[PDB]
């Protein structure tokens, strides 16, 4: 009686892909991720550890999984490991991860609101470590250039 | 703990309506409706009463509301009254009913499926009956009629 | 509690009806009710009022609705009004009441087990009554010949 | 303030139904009826046209999740000319069935029979049948059902 | 999934009822009420209206219904109306209200020192008021009074 | 307006009940009460007549699942002429009982005693007794109850 | 190995609300609660809406996420105001004026933030709780009446 | 419809921290803990093992995790290991443990109450026994020892 949207998103994912292709679809969904991050937001956090907690609490709110943030000192990169991306049928690459670019946008926006970053513009989905590690299907690894920010 | 898609659909609906406009959004949503209708289907119903029960059972599966069907034998039609369309933010005409053309596509398939397949039926929404009858916001009134007549 | 059987029962009701017809089906269903009645049962109750309470606790355990019992001052009968019979699609007479004969066997077993009945053989459901009151679709009204009155 | 339990439980009803049918008609006929019911279920809830086995697997599992009937894995065996179907957590309806607890298993043969046909570029007349020796050499859990989809030799 | 004790309590009430009096069972239950009152308690509330809110919060914690408190200055009493006492089969007077004396003890512990009422009080079930008001089976009426009185 | 979802919790009532009863009468009068309550529960919910130990185990798990009282395994030990009953996840009702947390354990004695007898056929006369010392070689969890079904002696 | 039941904060809020009221007055507590409200508003927010009806729908969806009730908005032309009726404020014991409405100032703060974001180039609004019209006639204990009026927000 | 307070508490944790700083917030929170313990309480417990069971029952009632109590010297010392303290954003030392002082105060009242009243005990959080043993973030290690208690 509380609405379920799985089936709707399953059919919507198929129709969109069919109509506009992978490239446009990915852009639409990043843009949706960015929009989502302007309706729900972390406070201004001091540490990456504190940000991890603020974000996991936002994810729990909508049941979209969990995330670990690792601050790599080279490229001053941020590794984002997202667990339990919701599944909406077989669409996406790999199959099941159709909603993965939404995360690119959402994290783009959420982290950029921390001021250690350069904007919500580019968050890179790693394909290599998402297929060389034998990472679970709904686990999404991403990378982000950051500034020299700490802890 | 089950994923909540309300926020994603709120933001997706704003995004789509900015890029493509009402009429293209409506045509995509109906097609999604048609696709849902090839995924979940009622059995061959002998009467409208029996069909109405079968349709409510399918609506129960995904929590998308309740339906009453009424044969308007004078008016060559069926009145479809869908209570409780799931609400996905303020988009749609009227506001709150973005998902309505999905119903049009879904009923189109569901009602033209078993015994309905004989006869060239269409299902279209009444956007004057909704403002005319003071129906609740998430109530969608639709009619099933035959296609064409001319000279 | 996790597996759902509604869809199974829906298609089971259609398959059984088509192979054996209404009459054999009613007999299979009554016999199932009597079997259910030998697996869960009330204690021996002195009064109809107390049996009413015991029967509703049993029904609450499986979610099959509520019942009121009425010892008819003297038809030498017991009126059973059962509310919210589980709906199993559109099969049954009237549509939606496929599971109604199970109740006949269930109350035949449950009541007989108390001081005052002649066996689980005959519980007749009232058809004309269900159309005298204008009774909701899932309210099932039944009558049992009874020995003498338990208050 | 009461939840008028809109969780009707059908487990007790199904336990007694299963005992009752097995008493009246026996194993072979119970199994055909159940396969037929499975076919029926497969005309009400359906996957979309999938290009690959792995995509089909995801689509089937979303359908089972929708009704809480377990999880499935599909594996192509070219050497055996078959698709292996391993269904886990078949709902248990009491002790009927062979082995006990697996009364509902034939419903899967009919269901997977409806759901796997014309999927992933498989074109023809196929039968999903259950394999009781396969379940055994595995030491498979009680509610795990193993089936093979093969080209039809005889059964329909 | 979580244990249900309704069946255990239905059988328990019967077994305790058969071995000992109505009255010995009622004193046992009253003592269990006092017991429950040493395990969950309200804060010291300034008014009777604040006590009512606090008592309902404690009732909601365990799901034992709701309470209204009325000061009756003339009659020198606090009327206590408890709605939706859990039903535990058909034991008790009237049937269904077997747990009623548990409230006598419980409200006994919960009310005495609140609202600037400083003395020695007894909470007593006024059964004769439950039929005076055409009160549902699971509604229990109690009066909080000063200790000693006549016929 | 109040909550759409609250069904009554009896845990708190039962912790305080177990306490008062222990206080008024001793352990053994408490245990005999709860045995009798168990026998009474065995008359309200029951298994069909089962062919085998495995089928009976499944049927009893179905009954226990109906009320949320745990799971059970049954083993025929044809050398002690006994049936070992291992009940897991006995509902805990405070700290009463021996060991603490197992107050409800004699309900299981009565309950299983009634179920087993219903399944005795023409030739069986059984009693079920709780074995607390064999809860030491198992070093079982607190809410696990071990019982033995044995032929009744009926001698002196 | 997951924990099953989600934590309940009802009891904790009941004790916290007593202790704060005991330590500081109605007044310090209320400005404390209004600032939490404003802080909540920077974390959950509506998109920019073009009408009041559209804003009403967007707010009810925010409120639905955290289960904090429902709101209706009504623009009043003859007054310079928008009436905000909030139903089912979560009840957190008997603290507050009236008892049970302790969380109400969070709402002033919350709607203050949301409504400022909705205000265009010309608006400069304050939202204030109107107590003596909640109790002018017969609104439920957990129904809060607020008015949004034109004048600068802070103090 | 079950109001969620996580977001209120995240924001309140920041506002309180901002205004008064760590030591004053902590003392407030210990007072809250003691107040929670005058509202929900264990019974008399002859042993630590009986207390542990009763304490876990009270915690399950509110969903605040689990506890193991270990006696080190018969009357001298108790170690209290608390699992799954509710997380409430990134506040607290270490981040995520803002609610920890409440436990100091709750256990202070729980273990101090009944037997344990006769010791003049104080419960205090060990901050580098948590990290020396590399305990989970929401696991709180406290000790009960002798020293002055009241204000």
Nearest to H90 by CA among A62, A114, A100: A114
User: Peptide bond preceding C94: is omega within 30 degrees of 0, i.e. cis?
Assistant: yes
Residue carrying structure tokens 């006549």: E150
**Which helix (DSSP H) or strand (DSSP E) does residue H7 occupy?**
helix H6-20
Give dist(CA H89, CA A104) in Å, integer.
23
Which residues in chain D are closer than 8 Å to C57, comparing Cβ atoms?
none
Cross-chain residue pair A45–H87, CB shorter than 8 Å: no
Both structure tokens of B76:
């060559």
Contact H149, H121 (CB under 8 A): yes
Nearest to H37 by CA among D143, G11, F11, G59: G11
Which stretches of chain E are assigned E, i.e. beta strand? Answer: 66-72, 77-83, 121-125, 140-146
Contact E95, C53 (CB under 8 A): yes
Cross-chain residue pair F91–E7, CB shorter than 8 Å: no
Q: Does G120 touch chain B (CB under 8 A)?
A: no
Contact A35, G48 (CB under 8 A): no
Q: What Cα–Cα distance (Å) separates residue D3 from each residue in A36, C65, D8, F6, F8? A: 34, 11, 12, 8, 11
Q: Give partners of H (≥3 CB pairs < 8 A).
A: A, E, F, G
Contact C82, C142 (CB under 8 A): yes
Residues 6+ apart with CB under 8 A from B149: none
Give dist(CA C150, CA C117) in Å, integer.
11
Which residues in chain H are closer than 8 Å to E42, comparing Cβ atoms?
39
Cross-chain residue pair G61–B10, CB shorter than 8 Å: yes
Which stretches of chain D are assigned E, i.e. beta strand? Answer: 71-77, 82-88, 126-130, 145-151
Nearest to G62 by CA among A38, A8, A56: A38
Q: Does F54 touch chain D (CB under 8 A)?
A: yes
CATH architecture for segment(s) B1-39: Up-down Bundle (1.20)
The string of DSSP codes covering B41-102 is -----SSHHHHHHHHHHHHHHHT--EEEEEEETTTTEEEEEEE-PPP-SS-TTTTT-TTHHH
**Which helix (DSSP H) or strand (DSSP E) does residue H18 occupy?**
helix H6-20
Breaks (C-N over 2.5 A) in chain C follow: none
CATH architecture for segment(s) G1-43: Up-down Bundle (1.20)
Both structure tokens of H124:
């205090």
Contact D66, D107 (CB under 8 A): no
Number of other residues whose CB lies within 10 A of the CB of residue D82: 18
Q: Does A14 touch chain D (CB under 8 A)?
A: yes
Contact D130, D97 (CB under 8 A): no
Give dist(CA C52, CA H25) in Å, integer.
57
Contact C114, C42 (CB under 8 A): yes
Contact D118, D142 (CB under 8 A): no
Nearest to A121 by CA among A151, A144, A95, A148: A144
Nearest to B120 by CA among B102, B97, B144, B89: B144
Cross-chain residue pair F100–H57, CB shorter than 8 Å: no
Cross-chain residue pair B15–A31, CB shorter than 8 Å: yes
Both structure tokens of E139:
């509604």
Identify the closest residue of chain D to A5 by CA–CA distance: D66
A17 alpha-carbon distance from chain centroid: 19
Residue ranges, CATH 3.30.70.2590, chain B: 40-151
Nearest to A70 by CA among A45, A47, A46, A100: A47
Q: Give partners of D (≥3 CB pairs < 8 A).
A: A, B, C, F
Residues 6+ apart with CB under 8 A from F79: none
Nearest to A115 by CA among A70, A48, A60: A48
Indicate the Cα dihedral angle D96, D102, D106, D109, nearest 10°.
Answer: 180
Disruptive mutation site among G35, G41, G44 for chain A (greatest number of A CBs within 10 Å): G44
- Contacts by residues G19-23 (CB-CB < 8 Å, ≥ 24 positions apart): G19/H28, G19/H31, G19/H32, G19/H35, G20/H28, G21/G95, G21/G102, G23/H28
- Top-tier CATH class for F45-156: alpha beta
Chains A and F touch (3+ CB pairs under 8 A): no
SS3 A101: helix
| Maximum distance among all Cα pairs of chain G, rounded to whole angstroms | 60
Identify the closest residue of chain C to D33 by CA–CA distance: C15
DSSP label at B37?
T
Give dist(CA F127, CA A82) in Å, integer.
56
SS3 B121: strand
Both structure tokens of E94:
């009237």
Q: What Cα–Cα distance (Å) separates residue B69 from each residue in C4, E113, F135? A: 27, 61, 63
Both structure tokens of H43:
């019974």
Q: What Cα–Cα distance (Å) separates residue A150 from each residue in A58, A69, A71, A146? A: 22, 12, 8, 10
E80 alpha-carbon distance from chain centroid: 8
CA-CA-CA-CA torsion sign (E129, E135, E138, E144): negative
How far does the CA of residue A49 sit from the closest CA of chain B (Å)?
23
Nearest to H151 by CA among G23, G18, G29: G23
| Maximum distance among all Cα pairs of chain B, rounded to whole angstroms | 59
Cross-chain residue pair A87–D58, CB shorter than 8 Å: yes
Beta-carbon-side half-sphere exposure of residue F98 (alpha carbons within 13 Å): 10
Q: Give partners of A (≥3 CB pairs < 8 A).
A: B, D, G, H
Both structure tokens of G45:
């927010």
Q: Does D70 touch chain F (CB under 8 A)?
A: no
Strand pairing report for E66-72 and E77-83: antiparallel
SS3 B147: coil
Q: What Cα–Cα distance (Å) separates residue C107 from each residue in C51, C110, C124, F150? A: 11, 5, 11, 37
Nearest to D5 by CA among A1, C54, C65: C65
Which residues in chain C are closer than 8 Å to B54, comparing Cβ atoms?
89-90
Beta-carbon-side half-sphere exposure of residue H84 (alpha carbons within 13 Å): 18
Strand-pairing partners, residue H124, are H143
Both structure tokens of C10:
């829906």
Number of other residues whose CB lies within 10 A of the CB of residue A94: 16
The string of DSSP codes covering H24-74 is HHHHHHHHHHHHHTTTB-----SSHHHHHHHHHHHHHHHT--EEEEEEEET
φ, ψ (nearest 5 deg) of residue G129: -75, 130
- Top-tier CATH class for G44-155: alpha beta
Identify the closest residue of chain F to E40 by CA–CA distance: F12
Q: Does D12 touch chain F (CB under 8 A)?
A: yes
CA-CA-CA-CA torsion sign (B109, B111, B115, B120): negative
Strand pairing report for E121-125 and G70-76: unpaired
Give the residue ranges of DSSP H helices in chain F: 11-24, 27-41, 53-67, 105-117
Q: Does A66 touch chain B (CB under 8 A)?
A: no
Contact G17, G95 (CB under 8 A): yes
Give dist(CA A57, CA A60) in Å, integer.
5
Burial A52-75 (b: 16+ CB within 10 A, else e): bbbbbbbbbbbebbebebebeeee
Both structure tokens of F154:
């009926």
Both structure tokens of F9:
């919790």
Contact C147, C132 (CB under 8 A): no
DSSP label at A40?
B
Cross-chain residue pair A19–B28, CB shorter than 8 Å: yes
Contact F118, F44 (CB under 8 A): no
- Starting at the edge strand found earlier in the chain, the sheet holding F126-130 runs F71-77, F82-88, F145-151, F126-130
The string of DSSP codes covering D120-136 is SS--S-EEEEE-HHHHH
CATH architecture for segment(s) B40-151: 2-Layer Sandwich (3.30)
| Maximum distance among all Cα pairs of chain C, rounded to whole angstroms | 46
DSSP label at G85?
E
Indicate the Cα dihedral angle B94, B100, B101, B102, nearest 10°.
Answer: 160
Nearest CB to A41: which of G43, G65, G66? G43
Beta-carbon-side half-sphere exposure of residue H23 (alpha carbons within 13 Å): 0
Nearest to C107 by CA among C41, C46, C60: C41
Both structure tokens of C118:
């002649």
Residue ranges, CATH 1.20.5.3790, chain D: 2-44
Number of other residues whose CB lies within 10 A of the CB of residue F144: 15
Disruptive mutation site among G61, G72, G73, G114 for chain B (greatest number of B CBs within 10 Å): G61
Nearest to A71 by CA among A43, A53, A51: A51
CATH architecture for segment(s) F2-44: Up-down Bundle (1.20)
The approach used to solve this structure was: X-ray
Residue ranges, CATH 3.30.70.2590, chain G: 44-155
Give dist(CA D147, CA D34) in Å, integer.
15
Nearest to F49 by CA among F128, F151, F124: F124
CA-CA-CA-CA torsion sign (A57, A60, A61, A64): positive
The string of DSSP codes covering G45-103 is -----SSHHHHHHHHHHHHHHHT--EEEEEEETTTTEEEEEEE-PPP-SS-TTTTT-TT
Residue ranges, CATH 3.30.70.2590, chain D: 45-156
Give dist(CA D61, CA G9) in Å, integer.
36
First to last CA, chain E: 50
φ, ψ (nearest 5 deg) of residue F16: -75, -35
Q: Does G21 touch chain B (CB under 8 A)?
A: no
The string of DSSP codes covering C95-143 is TT-TTHHHHHHHHHHHHHTSTTBS-SS--EEPHHHHTTTT--TT-EEEE
Residue ranges, CATH 1.20.5.3790, chain A: 1-39
Nearest to E125 by CA among E95, E96, E148, E93: E93
Contact H53, F100 (CB under 8 A): yes
Give dist(CA D21, CA C28) in Å, integer.
8
Number of other residues whose CB lies within 10 A of the CB of residue D36: 20
Cross-chain residue pair D44–C10, CB shorter than 8 Å: yes
CA-CA-CA-CA torsion sign (C123, C129, C133, C138): positive
Q: What Cα–Cα distance (Å) separates residue E117 from each residue in E58, E114, G94? A: 21, 6, 18
Cross-chain residue pair H12–G44, CB shorter than 8 Å: no
Both structure tokens of G23:
């330590």
Number of other residues whose CB lies within 10 A of the CB of residue D20: 17
Residues 6+ apart with CB under 8 A from A14: A89, A91, B35, D48
Give dist(CA E14, CA E9) in Å, integer.
8
Residue carrying structure tokens 């950029």: A112
**Which helix (DSSP H) or strand (DSSP E) does residue G128 occupy?**
strand G125-129
């Amino acid at each position: 009686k509380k609405p379920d949207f799985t089936l709707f998103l399953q059919t919507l994912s198929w129709e969109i892909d069919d109509q506009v292709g992978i490239e446009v679809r990915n852009e639409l969904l990043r843009e949706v991720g960015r929009g989502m991050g302007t309706r729900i937001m972390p406070p201004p956090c001091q540490t990456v550890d504190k940000l991890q907690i603020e974000l996991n609490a936002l994810l729990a709110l909508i049941g979209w999984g969990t995330v670990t943030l690792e601050l790599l000192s080279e490229d001053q990169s941020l590794r984002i490991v997202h667990e339990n991306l919701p599944q909406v049928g077989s669409a996406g690459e790999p199959s099941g991860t159709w909603l993965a670019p939404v995360l690119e946008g959402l994290y783009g926006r959420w982290v950029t609101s921390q001021a250690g970053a350069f904007g919500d513009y580019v968050v890179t989905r790693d394909v290599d470590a998402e297929d060389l590690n034998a990472v679970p299907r709904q686990t999404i690894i991403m990378y982000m250039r950051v500034r020299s920010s700490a802890t």
